[PDB]
Amino acid sequence: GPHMATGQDRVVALVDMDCFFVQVEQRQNPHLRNKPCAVVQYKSWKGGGIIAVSYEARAFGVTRSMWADDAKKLCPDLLLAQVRESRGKANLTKYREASVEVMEIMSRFAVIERASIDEAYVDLTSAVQERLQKLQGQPISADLLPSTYIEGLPQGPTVQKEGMRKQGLFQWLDSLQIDNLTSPDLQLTVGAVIVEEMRAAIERETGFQCSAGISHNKVLAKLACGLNKPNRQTLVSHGSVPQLFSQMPIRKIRSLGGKLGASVIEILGIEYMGELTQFTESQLQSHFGEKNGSWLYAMCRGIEHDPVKPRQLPKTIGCSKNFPGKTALATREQVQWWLLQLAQELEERLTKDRNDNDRVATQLVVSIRVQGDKRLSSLRRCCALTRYDAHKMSHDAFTVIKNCNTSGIQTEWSPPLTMLFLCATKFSAS
DNA sequence: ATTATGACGCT
DNA sequence: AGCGTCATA
Ligand SMILES: [Ca+2]
Ligand SMILES: [Mn+2]
Ligand SMILES: [Mn+2]
């Protein structure tokens, strides 16, 4: 009852750019705007692999991971933008720099956690308190929430999408307890007002549109964000969770999309997140471990305490390339040339990082895959990263992997290598 | 031949 | 440390 924590102490948002690499290319090339279009890497093999898809193209059934030749079968007028190639590999610099544009704007509002190239979490708890005292107990107008959905509304006793959105928003605002500075629903609402402002700032200053979720923790904020994309934001209140979770497939919740989520489903014989409430914490811990069990017990009730980490910059800088099928590297000269290509891009990014961010990487991680191995990585070895020099890094990388060569012939490499990966880690301030 | 990443957990 | 899981464009 009175001592039952309800996980309503924070206001957390997740902001995620719509079709992000597509928007980056559409900003650059106005001919691609408002068209079915996609971003592709490489070209020779089946027109290249698709990694981002505009909402116009999604309407034709175009998806990520599709070959462009195959996407063209669904959407013959599909427009394509190719990822840059440098040193024989895809180079994602344009998108990393565009990401920085967005992250720097968000950081003006609050501490952010960079969660991917195109999204960040925001802890808005403090900003909400300040906006609340500024408002002087004044009601919140629907005009301050022009792109917000309230999940679960309208309900109770119009056939247009925007009309439904407004109906739900009106019901929500009509009910609001604006006299209480500590009502969690009011706090989320003010959070949503700030996120409208954040999203308006991002679009004004970059041209990029985004969606957002506003809730009491990161998992619900992430889930909320996807409920009404593109170019909209969704408030998921504590109260909305039972109905929301009652038909929510378990795999939709962050961290349950894989083997663990599959095991929750199989072992417990359930399908939806809400069904987890019928197990004791000990029962869940017995099947899924102490940490996962406690997390599941609280999460199915809408409660999670994972903090928004103060981290705007990536913790690692990596360069990787696959060498599929017949392109697998079979000679020492081959392996060494590509290590050099990778190491040269890595040096470029590392040197830029050192100047921009006042830090230095101190460890080099080298990873490879061998033909025949199903695993993403076959072997991972580390060595010291003492100098930002590509020739040294590539020589060092070779030294730590060269004994993987099962060939009796030195010149040859067996089994052939189907992936190389160089990753700079363990940064220290400089 | 689904590619290039990046964070974090386990032992 | 090296490996595995889960995640996003
Ligand atoms: Ca996105
Ligand atoms: Mn994203
Ligand atoms: Mn996506």
Q: Is A325 helix (H, G, I), strand (E, B) or coil?
A: helix
Do A9 and A129 lie in one domain? The reply is yes
The enclosing domain of A227 has a CATH number of: 3.30.70.270
CA distances from A230 to A20, A108, A180, A211 (A): 11, 23, 33, 6
CATH of the domain at A415: 3.30.1490.100
- Are A54 and A202 within one domain? no
Read off the CATH number of the domain in which A75 is found.
3.40.1170.60
Nucleotide nearest to A39 (CA to C1'): C9
* A207 and A148 fall within a common domain: yes
Q: Dihedral of the CA atoms A180, A186, A188, A192 (nearest 10)?
A: -130
Are A323 and A182 part of one and the same domain?
no
Distance CA A380, CA A421 (A): 9
Cβ contact A79:A35 at 8 Å: yes
Nearest to A52 by CA among A95, A110, A104: A95
- List the CATH number of the domain containing A261: 1.10.150.20
Say whether the CB atom of A1 is under 7 angstroms from strand C.
no
Residues A356 and A266 occupy one common structural domain: no
Q: Are residues A7 and A98 in the same domain?
A: yes
Task: Return chain A residues 182..241 having CB < 7 Å to nucleic acid strand B.
Answer: none
In the Cβ-directed half-sphere of A237, how many Cα atoms lie within 13 Å?
Answer: 20
Q: How far is CA A389 from CA A19, A103, A319, A359, A394, in A?
A: 36, 29, 15, 16, 9
What domain range includes position A369? 308-430
Residues with Cβ within 8 Å of A284's Cβ and at least 6 positions away in sequence, in order, are: A276, A292, A293, A294, A296, A297
Q: In terms of domains, do A240 and A330 share one?
A: no
Q: Is A17 annotated as a binding residue?
A: yes
Does A5 share its domain with A134?
yes
DSSP, res A67 = B
CB A68 within 8 A of CB A49: yes
Q: Are residues A102 and A81 part of one domain?
A: no
Same domain, A420 and A316: yes
CA distance A281 to A277: 9
Residue reference for tokens 């190491």: A343
Domain C-terminal end among A307, A332, A356: A307
A42: left (phi over 0), alpha (psi -120 to 50) or beta: left
Q: In the structure encoding, which two tokens stand for residue A124, read together?
A: 């808005």
Q: Is A179 within any annotated ligand binding site?
A: no
Is residue A16 part of an annotated ligand binding site? Answer: yes
Regarding whether A105 and A234 lie in a shared domain, the answer is yes
Which residue among A88, A103, A129 closes a domain?
A88
Sequential DSSP letters for A79-138: EEEEPPEETTEE--HHHHHHHHHHHHHHTTTS-EEEEETTEEEEE-HHHHHHHHHHHTTP
The reply to whether the CB atom of residue A316 sits less than 7 A from any atom in nucleic acid chain C is no
Q: Which of residues 280-309 of A touch strand B (CB under 7 A)?
A: 289, 291-292, 309
Query: Which of the nucleotides lies closest to A226 (Cα–C1')?
Result: C8
The sign of the torsion formed by the CA atoms of A123, A306, A151, A105 equals positive
A269 and A417 share one domain: no
| A118 assigned to a ligand binding site | yes
The alpha carbon of A223 and the centre of ligand 3 are apart by a number of angstroms equal to: 13
Distance, CA of A217 to CA of A9 (rounded, Å): 9
Question: Domain tally for chain A?
Answer: 4
Answer with the one of A202, A218, A249 that is the final residue of a domain. A249
Instruction: Please give the nucleotide, over all strands, whose C1' is closest to the CA of residue A51.
Output: C9
Experimental technique: X-ray
Enumerate the nucleotides of strand C whose atoms come under 7 Å of any protein CB.
1-9
